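Case study.
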Amino acid sequence: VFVSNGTHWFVTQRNFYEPQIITTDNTFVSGNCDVVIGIVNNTVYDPLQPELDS
Amino acid sequence: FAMQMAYRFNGIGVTQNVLYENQKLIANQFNSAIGKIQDSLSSTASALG
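After joint prediction, the assembly is written out as follows.
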């Protein structure tokens, strides 16, 4: 589930707080922003880009 | 409550996007179905048999 400490956005297990940096490994795409009530503008990290840049 | 129902869907193997991308429709189906409970219970004494 998504959470913020107040400044940064994390994803965590539902039953024990373990904040992970949000990536396309933790998260699945669907549709576009318009349809979801209460969606938030944020950054998702892409683990492949530094590996291609290196 | 929308994030609870997204877990309720996840618990039947229906992925969470099937909830938020239909949220108003799911809310209206719940509200309409709740409306039919009043009419069902009000109309016949046989339901509490």
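Observations recorded in class. Strands of chain A lie at 2-4, 9-11, 20-21. Chain A has one helix and three strands. We will return to this complex in the next lecture.
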